[PDB]
Design an enzyme around this catalytic site. Structure first.
Site, PDB file in Angstrom:
ATOM      1  N   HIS A   1       2.408  -2.751  -0.322  1.00 26.11           N
ATOM      2  CA  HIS A   1       1.453  -2.003   0.495  1.00 26.11           C
ATOM      3  C   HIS A   1       1.599  -2.295   1.990  1.00 26.11           C
ATOM      4  O   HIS A   1       0.775  -1.827   2.777  1.00 26.11           O
ATOM      5  CB  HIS A   1       0.007  -2.240   0.026  1.00 26.11           C
ATOM      6  CG  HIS A   1      -0.519  -3.632   0.240  1.00 26.11           C
ATOM      7  ND1 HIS A   1      -0.554  -4.246   1.474  1.00 26.11           N
ATOM      8  CD2 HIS A   1      -1.094  -4.502  -0.626  1.00 26.11           C
ATOM      9  CE1 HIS A   1      -1.096  -5.445   1.355  1.00 26.11           C
ATOM     10  NE2 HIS A   1      -1.434  -5.625   0.091  1.00 26.11           N
TER      11      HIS A   1
ATOM     12  N   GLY B   1      -5.070 -10.439   6.521  1.00 27.28           N
ATOM     13  CA  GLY B   1      -3.778 -10.957   6.915  1.00 27.28           C
ATOM     14  C   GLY B   1      -3.155 -11.943   5.949  1.00 27.28           C
ATOM     15  O   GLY B   1      -1.995 -12.325   6.144  1.00 27.28           O
TER      16      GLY B   1
ATOM     17  N   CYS C   1      -2.360 -11.476   2.808  1.00 29.21           N
ATOM     18  CA  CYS C   1      -1.493 -10.873   1.803  1.00 29.21           C
ATOM     19  C   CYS C   1      -0.077 -11.423   1.914  1.00 29.21           C
ATOM     20  O   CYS C   1       0.441 -11.640   3.013  1.00 29.21           O
ATOM     21  CB  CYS C   1      -1.470  -9.351   1.955  1.00 29.21           C
ATOM     22  SG  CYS C   1      -3.051  -8.549   1.619  1.00 29.21           S
TER      23      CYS C   1
HETATM   24  O1  LIG Z   1      -5.710  -8.612   4.475  1.00 30.54           O
HETATM   25  C1  LIG Z   1      -6.296  -8.230   3.522  1.00 30.54           C
HETATM   26  C2  LIG Z   1      -7.152  -9.201   2.696  1.00 30.54           C
HETATM   27  C3  LIG Z   1      -6.629 -10.023   1.710  1.00 30.54           C
HETATM   28  N1  LIG Z   1      -7.440 -10.839   1.047  1.00 30.54           N
HETATM   29  C4  LIG Z   1      -8.738 -10.909   1.288  1.00 30.54           C
HETATM   30  C5  LIG Z   1      -9.337 -10.100   2.282  1.00 30.54           C
HETATM   31  C6  LIG Z   1     -10.643  -9.923   2.780  1.00 30.54           C
HETATM   32  C7  LIG Z   1     -10.589  -8.962   3.779  1.00 30.54           C
HETATM   33  N2  LIG Z   1      -9.319  -8.562   3.896  1.00 30.54           N
HETATM   34  C8  LIG Z   1      -8.542  -9.244   2.991  1.00 30.54           C
HETATM   35  N3  LIG Z   1      -6.233  -6.809   3.176  1.00 30.54           N
HETATM   36  C9  LIG Z   1      -6.891  -6.180   2.015  1.00 30.54           C
HETATM   37  C10 LIG Z   1      -5.803  -5.582   1.117  1.00 30.54           C
HETATM   38  C11 LIG Z   1      -5.122  -4.454   1.846  1.00 30.54           C
HETATM   39  C12 LIG Z   1      -5.002  -3.202   1.449  1.00 30.54           C
HETATM   40  C13 LIG Z   1      -4.283  -2.194   2.388  1.00 30.54           C
HETATM   41  C14 LIG Z   1      -2.867  -2.160   2.412  1.00 30.54           C
HETATM   42  C15 LIG Z   1      -2.231  -1.261   3.269  1.00 30.54           C
HETATM   43  C16 LIG Z   1      -2.983  -0.408   4.087  1.00 30.54           C
HETATM   44  C17 LIG Z   1      -4.373  -0.450   4.056  1.00 30.54           C
HETATM   45  C18 LIG Z   1      -5.023  -1.363   3.190  1.00 30.54           C
HETATM   46  C19 LIG Z   1      -6.565  -1.404   3.166  1.00 30.54           C
HETATM   47  S1  LIG Z   1      -7.299  -1.036   1.548  1.00 30.54           S
HETATM   48  O2  LIG Z   1      -8.688  -1.497   1.571  1.00 30.54           O
HETATM   49  O3  LIG Z   1      -7.254   0.417   1.370  1.00 30.54           O
HETATM   50  C20 LIG Z   1      -6.564  -1.747   0.039  1.00 30.54           C
HETATM   51  C21 LIG Z   1      -7.054  -1.301  -1.200  1.00 30.54           C
HETATM   52  C22 LIG Z   1      -6.525  -1.817  -2.385  1.00 30.54           C
HETATM   53  C23 LIG Z   1      -5.512  -2.775  -2.332  1.00 30.54           C
HETATM   54  C24 LIG Z   1      -5.026  -3.216  -1.109  1.00 30.54           C
HETATM   55  C25 LIG Z   1      -5.571  -2.701   0.095  1.00 30.54           C
HETATM   56  C26 LIG Z   1      -4.556  -4.943   3.149  1.00 30.54           C
HETATM   57  C27 LIG Z   1      -5.453  -5.849   3.970  1.00 30.54           C
END
Ligand SMILES: O=C(c1cncc2cc[nH]c12)N1CCC(=C2c3ccccc3CS(=O)(=O)c3ccccc32)CC1
Ligand SMILES: O=C(c1cncc2cc[nH]c12)N1CCC(=C2c3ccccc3CS(=O)(=O)c3ccccc32)CC1
Lengths: 301, 301
Positions: free
Chosen positions: B41, B143, B145
């Site tokens: 992703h 961040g 991931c």
């Molecule tokens: O960096 C963390 C992260 C990792 N672990 C804990 C936390 C808490 C806050 N952010 C955290 N991302 C959450 C997981 C992410 C995504 C993602 C990937 C690419 C583009 C947009 C998004 C946003 S998405 O919401 O559509 C989503 C939905 C389902 C699976 C993955 C993703 C990335 C950032």
């Protein structure tokens, strides 16, 4: 999100752990530049520990009586002296893996990472807090003496603890890297005991802020209380007094959640008087006091 | 003595964490030999995640759209492919700090260490267990991931987890290093939910053994029971079934304390039916199920 007891990465410290052998005893040493630091009781027999004259015992020791082994390369000892309760063995080779480091003496309430080692090799890493009575509730077996506690501030490793002994109550005591014990403890076999421990109040409050940041919010109320009337409740439940320095330290956490420090103290007042009533906070059924305000900010943002 | 949540030393893994950038997104990658592993992703915008066709989105990305930075060393990408939910970036430089490693898929109930990373730089390390519902109760921020979970079997690092996402309940989901999610979760923005979690019975029993090893014996009883009679109580309290394989694994622990597994089960049966009466076990007021029998033996000896 989420909140865990999180240690610093141990890589820079793993490269400084060596094995120190004196006769039949093997423990761990800390190899920094051309010096190996370890607990001085490595030179004692069981009979010596009843009443050890360390100056006299170290005088009977020669440079060739100390075996320092870094992995598979033997480091030759070219000098030995005693700084308080640590033995500094000067070696013929500077550690090429020596990081930017500093020796610090921490205060009760502050935390550090422990690299538990046996035979010079790291076994595991975990977080500990210096208790108010200057003990730590660690996980140490026989052979773990010389394992060190540390923080990683900026790019510099601040060594603060070297493990020396276990007390009868199962807690652990040790020194700073200059050989000075935390607390009244001594490296001899006597009837020493850890004094009455107390709960680190400013740490519990930071942990509650961590709980609020992570969604756990049931313990919050609309009440308030002065600092003076909270400390009256804190004394009956064996809690440290809360000062204004403590309230200042909790500033960033309070200013982040919008909850005033004194309002958080009223919530802690209600949890002490009533209990959790079978509820949990951050997965715990007890109030946790081993997270400093720094630890919460570093992990919650 | 003492019993703590103890992570493996992270030094071998730190030397494999790199920064991966695709457009405006930066996350963590795993650099082993001449391949960098990271979540797929990374190529997605926020709008892509509502319904992502990863083959199509990757099709429009070229090698030069991927920037890999190992600290301050830029590794030029000469190839990119997708294996399940992980992106494999082939780079021009083999990692000189590559350790003896293996990719393993752990089973629910096993534990591992997590090296939380941000921008390719490690922040901290802690222990996690694969929950029966294939989540982990970790500590991850934006961040993080691409942070990986691992065990250190002998001198070989067994990579088992790469972090992908946080679920609405605050728990975390990821893949193995071959890109297969633990559980039913997918890397897209949908109404995903973790199933009902249960308590890892063999781990609680190992933990009670650890408690007995540490001197906590107040819960030990004179009564015994049978497997089906114990599992009957276990099923009522959301505890996983106890097999003979589980009793085999608890062999060294039962053979060391003198308490038989079925005798420890009756003690646990009584703790479930009655509670802990405000008492504590190993400094906890709750029953802990994130220590495998291997973890207890490794730590207690
Ligand atoms: O960096 C963390 C992260 C990792 N672990 C804990 C936390 C808490 C806050 N952010 C955290 N991302 C959450 C997981 C992410 C995504 C993602 C990937 C690419 C583009 C947009 C998004 C946003 S998405 O919401 O559509 C989503 C939905 C389902 C699976 C993955 C993703 C990335 C950032
Ligand atoms: O290896 C651990 C160790 C370290 N941490 C936790 C545990 C649990 C079991 N053993 C553990 N030693 C306990 C501390 C030790 C000593 C010591 C030092 C030299 C010679 C004999 C002894 C035995 S002494 O008892 O007289 C004693 C008394 C006061 C201070 C130090 C020592 C060494 C072994």
């Amino acid at each position: 999100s989420g909140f865990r007891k999180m240690a610093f990465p141990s890589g820079k410290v793993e490269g400084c752990m060596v094995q120190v052998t004196c006769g039949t005893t093997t423990l761990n040493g800390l190899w920094l530049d051309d010096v190996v630091y370890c607990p001085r009781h490595v030179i004692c027999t069981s009979e010596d520990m009843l009443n050890p004259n360390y100056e006299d015992l170290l005088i009977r020791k020669s440079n060739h009586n100390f075996l320092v082994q870094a992995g598979n390369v033997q480091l030759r000892v070219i000098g030995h002296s005693m700084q308080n309760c640590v033995l500094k063995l000067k070696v013929d080779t500077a550690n090429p893996k020596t990081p930017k480091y500093k020796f610090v003496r921490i205060q009760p309430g502050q935390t550090f990472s422990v690299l538990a080692c046996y035979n010079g090799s790291p076994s595991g890493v975990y977080q500990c807090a210096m208790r108010p009575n200057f003990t730590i509730k660690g996980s140490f077996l026989n052979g773990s003496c010389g394992s060190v506690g540390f923080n990683i501030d900026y790019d510099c490793v601040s060594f603060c603890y070297m493990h020396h002994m276990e007390l009868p109550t199962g807690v652990h005591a040790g020194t700073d890297l200059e050989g000075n014990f935390y607390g009244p403890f001594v490296d001899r076999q006597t009837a020493q005991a850890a004094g009455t421990d107390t709960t680190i109040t400013v740490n519990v409050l930071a942990w509650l802020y961590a709980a609020v940041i992570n969604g756990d919010r049931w313990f919050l109320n609309r009440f308030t209380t002065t600092l003076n009337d909270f400390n009256l409740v804190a004394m009956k439940y064996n809690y440290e007094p809360l000062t204004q320095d403590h309230v200042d330290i909790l500033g960033p956490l309070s200013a982040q959640t919008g909850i005033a420090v004194l309002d958080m103290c009223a919530s802690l007042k209600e949890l002490l008087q009533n209990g959790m009533n079978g509820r949990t906070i951050l997965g715990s059924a007890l109030l946790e006091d081993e997270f400093t305000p720094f630890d919460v900010v570093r992990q919650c943002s």
